[PDB]
Design a protein around this ligand. Structure first.
Ligand SMILES: Nc1ncnc2c1ncn2[C@H]1C[C@H](O)[C@@H](COP(=O)(O)OP(=O)(O)OP(=O)(O)O)O1
Ligand SMILES: Nc1ncnc2c1ncn2[C@H]1C[C@H](O)[C@@H](COP(=O)(O)OP(=O)(O)OP(=O)(O)O)O1
Ligand SMILES: Nc1ncnc2c1ncn2[C@H]1C[C@H](O)[C@@H](COP(=O)(O)OP(=O)(O)OP(=O)(O)O)O1
Ligand SMILES: Nc1ncnc2c1ncn2[C@H]1C[C@H](O)[C@@H](COP(=O)(O)OP(=O)(O)OP(=O)(O)O)O1
Ligand SMILES: Nc1ncnc2c1ncn2[C@H]1C[C@H](O)[C@@H](COP(=O)(O)OP(=O)(O)OP(=O)(O)O)O1
Ligand SMILES: [Mg+2]
Lengths: 647, 101
């Protein structure tokens, strides 16, 4: 017989036959007909004679189910094998994440639930047949698929003045204009973090200098008024008194009316200083609690320089007890005639920027004079030059050109983008030995995959339109080109076309290995094909733009949600191949693989033409004194490099 | 044999005879033994009679259950009634009633 049973916790107890009996009884009591001891006795006696000296709970339940199957009453087992499993899941949720297998902070868990619920429904009921077939076999990737039912857009560039000038009202919240520096950065943060809930991407504030520039004068005037309230003087000509730069130096060593004019500047500089560190800390804490970006570096006034110096000092110091802040992402604009050469006005700020970037990895650098960023309306005397300066985002996105509007990056955004798998096509075609036929097949398949991707992007577009204005309280009332003309319940079909659609690529070196023995950064013949394929994609993009009445651009994906999602599913189907499916990366859009020893010069040489070719986004990342970054910036200027991020 | 199947939603579609061999094949992968195709074919073919020319998916999945509880592979049977019960609780969610809103 059986004498000892080991409980699940670990205790050892004696064999009681009255517990294997009540369990089956409760299972039977919910199955229409409910029987009596006639079968209970048989099952219990059969179990308690064939067993060993000591048993476990799980083994006994295995025996119970095995006997309840080999009976005539099989409607009692199907209510056993279910209750037991529910209890297993319940007792396994005290230390694990069982609820996720079926489909840490509370908010993150709820968001995971929602994402997993939404994704398959879109994958089934919304896409079309050809698109679905393409997606299933690992040919393309639709970025941010879980927000599809919400007719959402990617990002925007805030016209921050339209909110500071007048008052903004969202829901029951209302806010008046600003009248000093402290109440300006706060409103900038409010508007920057209020629009995340209306979009599924990053946020940016261009012209960080000009928009806040008028707000370094107001505090100066107020301080003068307070310094002439008690003194009885009539310092009425100090209001619009031209200034050279808001520098601060010690006060002792003067007297009279020249003593009450250096103090005001000192207090004003301190006031402006505290606000910027508050801004940085706020944006840094919000993330852990929200991508963000700010652009500056091309203002030659006296207030703009003050703001730039204050922000640079605050970032160089750090946050908290000296830690490096992760946000906001800061980007420095370089132009030939403003801040580059020693004779230019803002050389000192450039040197300070290099000093800080040598340590805290910000700001990045954006060549404002590249051959594909220049604009033919930038006038150095206008007080509104910023309207003709390119601006970029932390996601490496570019929105400059337009076939039906002006050439600006203000109050514009991106609407979607999808990446295309290219290594798989080369591996698939690898079969035939003749070289020419492999290239012919590659070009034959690339066209079809491109057509499918374009159709998917257009269908996304057609769905995104038809969204009422009220669904986006802030974006479609103050921060989009056509706002101020849209009624609360009108569709946004008349202003949506001022946007962009991207087609991204990933892993070109592997694609080259599958058609030649060397990648782009090892053999001269290799690059002649990479250039050709990128050129093919750009030409087809132009054709699609003409056909569908939209804007299309090529893209180097940021590699944030799609890093290994492609290589794993490719090793399984086709198995290991040397140097193609053996690393668990797939390299980025068009860089040189990180595992190949190469210098800065050669990498830049091989990469610049691609920068020219990819209008929708590009990068040039190099991993390592303030003089080091000078070499990087000079390298960017020498060639047509657009956006560098050395750090 | 049968032709009409009334899916859960309420539509009517045609018999396929190949889907069953996928359902009674996926379970046997999580069972420490990949059963020979002979039993898959035998069980699949044994659903020829006992039909009515129109049976709901509930009936065709509540009848394959009482056929693995006999074919000397109850190891497969244990890991089939658990998956079905798991997925019959998720379906109670008012999710598809929100998307089509
Ligand atoms: N005294 C016992 N003798 C033999 N088998 C037992 C005994 N106690 C439990 N078992 C085995 C066989 C029963 O089918 C199975 C279910 O027992 P059950 O009483 O429901 O759980 P348990 O003993 O772990 O604690 P609980 O009171 O929390 O349910 O456990
Ligand atoms: N409502 C029911 N329907 C069907 N079978 C049941 C039901 N309640 C109990 N049973 C059967 C199957 C269970 O394996 C067995 C023991 O029940 P029970 O003591 O509640 O579970 P358990 O001991 O495995 O769970 P717990 O984790 O709570 O200890 O009795
Ligand atoms: N954190 C905040 N979020 C939103 N609104 C804010 C916040 N802090 C202040 N406000 C409001 C106060 C005002 O309505 C507006 C900012 O106005 P501001 O230029 O600072 O002064 P004011 O107009 O209130 O001054 P005065 O008292 O001289 O009229 O924003
Ligand atoms: N034509 C059919 N005739 C009879 N039973 C069927 C048929 N098609 C499916 N079934 C039943 C028994 C099969 O084991 C099982 C196959 O999967 P099923 O339950 O139909 O999936 P589903 O309809 O929930 O999802 P999916 O849309 O992903 O196929 O369903
Ligand atoms: N890995 C597996 N383990 C166990 N059972 C499986 C497995 N794969 C499939 N099955 C079973 C479950 C179903 O009976 C059939 C596959 O249909 P499936 O779509 O998974 O179920 P379902 O009809 O309950 O789906 P749903 O409610 O999600 O539409 O085969
Ligand atoms: Mg302070």
């Amino acid at each position: 017989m059986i004498q000892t049973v080991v409980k699940r916790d670990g205790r050892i107890v004696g064999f009681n036959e009255q517990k294997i009996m009540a369990a089956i009884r409760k299972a039977m009591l919910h199955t229409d007909k409910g029987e009596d001891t006639t079968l209970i006795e048989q099952i219990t006696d059969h179990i308690s004679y064939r067993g060993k000296s000591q048993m476990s709970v799980e083994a006994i339940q295995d025996a119970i189910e095995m006997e309840l199957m080999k009976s005539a009453r099989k409607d009692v087992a199907q209510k056993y094998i279910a209750y037991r499993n529910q209890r297993n899941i319940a007792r396994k949720a005290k230390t694990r994440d069982v609820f996720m297998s079926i489909v840490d902070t509370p908010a993150g868990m709820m968001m995971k639930f929602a994402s997993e619920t939404t994704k398959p429904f879109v994958d089934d009921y919304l896409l079309s047949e050809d698109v679905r077939d393409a997606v299933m076999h690992n040919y393309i990737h639709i970025h941010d698929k879980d927000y599809y039912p919400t007719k959402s857009l990617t990002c925007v560039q805030h016209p921050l003045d339209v909110i500071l000038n007048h008052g903004f009202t969202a829901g029951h919240g209302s806010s008046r204009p600003a009248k000093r520096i402290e109440t300006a950065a706060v409103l900038a943060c409010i508007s920057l973090e209020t629009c995340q809930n209306e979009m599924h991407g990053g946020q940016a504030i261009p012209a960080f200098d000009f928009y806040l520039a008028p707000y370094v004068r107001m505090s100066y005037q107020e301080e003068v008024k307070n310094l002439e309230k008690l003194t009885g003087e009539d310092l009425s000509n100090l209001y619009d008194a031209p200034i050279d730069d808001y520098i601060e130096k010690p006060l002792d060593g003067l007297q009279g009316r020249e003593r009450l004019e250096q103090h005001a500047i000192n207090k004003t500089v301190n006031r402006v200083h505290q606000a910027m560190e508050a801004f940085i800390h706020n944006m840094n804490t919000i993330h852990s609690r929200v991508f963000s970006s700010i652009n500056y570096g091309t203002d030659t006034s006296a207030e703009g320089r003050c703001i730039m110096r204050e922000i640079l000092q605050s970032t160089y110091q750090g946050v908290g007890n000296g830690e490096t802040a992760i946000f906001p992402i800061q980007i420095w604009k370089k132009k030939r005639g403003v801040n580059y050469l020693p004779e230019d006005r803002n050389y000192d700020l450039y040197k300070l920027a290099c000093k800080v970037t040598a340590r805290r990895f910000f700001p990045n650098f954006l060549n404002l004079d590249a051959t594909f960023n220049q604009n033919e309306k930038w006038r150095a005397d206008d007080p509104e030059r910023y309207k003709w300066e390119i601006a970029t985002m932390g996601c490496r996105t570019r929105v400059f050109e337009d076939r039906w509007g002006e050439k600006t990056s203000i109050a514009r955004g991106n609407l979607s983008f999808s990446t295309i798998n290219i290594v798989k096509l080369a591996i698939e075609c690898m079969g035939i030995e003749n070289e020419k036929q492999r290239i012919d097949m590659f070009f034959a398949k690339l066209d079809n995959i491109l057509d499918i991707t374009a159709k998917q992007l257009d269908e996304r577009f057609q769905f995104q339109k038809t969204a009422m204005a009220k669904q986006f309280p802030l974006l479609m009332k103050y921060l989009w080109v056509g706002a101020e003309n849209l009624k609360p319940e009108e569709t946004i079909e008349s202003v949506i076309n001022h946007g962009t659609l991207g087609i991204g690529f990933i892993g070109l070196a592997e694609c080259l290995v599958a058609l030649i023995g060397k990648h782009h950064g090892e053999s001269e013949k290799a690059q002649e094909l990479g250039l050709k394929i990128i050129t093919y994609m750009r030409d087809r993009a132009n054709e699609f733009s003409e056909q569908y009445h939209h804007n299309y651009s090529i893209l180097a994906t940021p590699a944030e949600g799609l890093s290994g999602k492609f290589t794993k599913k490719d090793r399984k189907q086709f198995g290991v191949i040397p140097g193609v499916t053996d690393r668990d990366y797939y390299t980025n859009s068009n860089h040189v693989p990180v595992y190949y020893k190469c210098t800065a010069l050669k990498k830049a040489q091989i990469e610049a033409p691609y920068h020219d070719l990819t209008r929708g986004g590009h990068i040039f990342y190099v991993e390592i004194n303030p003089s080091v970054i000078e070499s990087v910036v000079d390298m960017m200027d020498k060639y047509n490099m657009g956006y560098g991020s050395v750090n």
